Amino acid sequence: ENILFVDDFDAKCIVPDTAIWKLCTYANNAWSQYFRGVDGYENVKVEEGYLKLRACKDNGTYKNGGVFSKIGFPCGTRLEVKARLTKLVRGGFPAIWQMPIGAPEWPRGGQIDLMEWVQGSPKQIFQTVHTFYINGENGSAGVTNKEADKNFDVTKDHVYAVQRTEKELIFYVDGKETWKYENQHLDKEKLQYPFCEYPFNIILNFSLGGELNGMMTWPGEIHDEDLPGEMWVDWVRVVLLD
């Protein structure tokens, strides 16, 4: 099987590979708002074969932990990520996902979420597709997998995967297919399937929710007493398909 990229996070270093992995930065949205004033690698380390991403509160200030790949991947590929949460955190918002590189403004270039967790459904994860066709100017939910295992322990290791081709996206958990999002071969102007127009990166983060500009976010209310939380990523792999 053809390995286009792999990181086992087992390099003789205390931070993830500095050529591949960049620290996440502040932006006025739910997942990014608490990268503000995160000092370098304070919430991000490599240790005992894991990337360890921490979310915590530091003298009044919520701080996220996350990195994104500077490298990205074409179509005809499958991304596999092994990860667990150390615990459930109320208001915690950990994610394993992909953004297009150099695409028009979100959500026009698309977005793929291999894993998200929120306190509102604590014994499940979400696998989600975003496009301008789905979301338009006003939508943020995307299309998510409704038959998601309802009886599932996020604090154990799982392998989250998406296979991306011109035909479709196929999601997996622990090597079992969960759902697919098909190319409908519509007018290019509808932007229904942008997933081969730009390379997609890898994003790994443990973010905190609560209010954004006075509106409650999907991950809901932050319970300070539950903090800190960590996501441990054992490995990331991108395979070239047949």
Ligand X SMILES: CC(=O)N[C@H]1[C@H](O[C@@H]2[C@@H](O)[C@H](O)O[C@H](CO)[C@@H]2O)O[C@H](CO)[C@@H](O[C@@H]2O[C@H](CO)[C@H](O)[C@H](O)[C@H]2O)[C@@H]1O
The residues of the shown chain that bind ligand X, judged by CB under 6 A, are 27-32, 93, 95, 97, 99, 106, 111, 113, 116, 130, 140
Q: List the single partner that 16 binds among Ca ion, Na ion, ligand X, none, CB under 5 to 8 Å by kind.
A: Na ion
Query: Exposed (0-12), middle (13-18) or buried (19+): which is 223, by Cβ within 10 Å?
Result: middle
Q: Assess contact for 51 and 65: CB atoms under 8 A.
A: no
Based on CB atoms, which residue is closest to ligand X, 7 or 113? Answer: 113
Contact mark string toward Na ion, 135..174, x via CB under 5 A = ----------------------------------------
Give CA–CA dist 133/182, Å, rounded: 13
Binding flag, residue 8, Ca ion (CB under 5 A): yes
Nearest approach, Cβ of 180 to Ca ion (angstroms)? 29
Binding flag, residue 107, Na ion (CB under 5 A): no
Q: List the single partner that 163 binds among Ca ion, Na ion, ligand X, none, CB under 5 to 8 Å by kind.
A: none
Instruction: State the residue for tokens 């196929």.
Output: 170
Q: Assess contact for 91 and 212: CB atoms under 8 A.
A: no
Q: Assess contact for 206 and 54: CB atoms under 8 A.
A: yes
Binding flag, residue 120, Ca ion (CB under 5 A): no
Task: Out of 7, 9, 119, 209, point to the residue binding Ca ion (CB under 5 A).
Answer: 9
Binding flag, residue 128, Na ion (CB under 5 A): yes
Longest CA–CA span in the chain (Å) reads: 52
Task: Out of 14, 25, 37, 49, point to the residue binding Ca ion (CB under 5 A).
Answer: 49
Q: List the single partner that 2 binds among ligand X, Na ion, Ca ion, none, CB under 5 to 8 Å by kind.
A: none
Give CA–CA dist 81/96, Å, rounded: 8
Give CA–CA dist 40/227, Å, rounded: 20
Backbone CA torsion sign across 76, 182, 198, 176: negative
Name the β-bridge partners of 84. Answer: 232
Based on CB atoms, which residue is closest to ligand X, 193 or 200? Answer: 200
The tokens describing 71, both together, are 């490298």
Based on CB atoms, which residue is closest to Ca ion, 11 or 186? Answer: 11
Binding flag, residue 126, Na ion (CB under 5 A): yes
Contacts with Na ion by CB under 5 A lie at 15-16, 18, 21, 113, 116, 126, 128
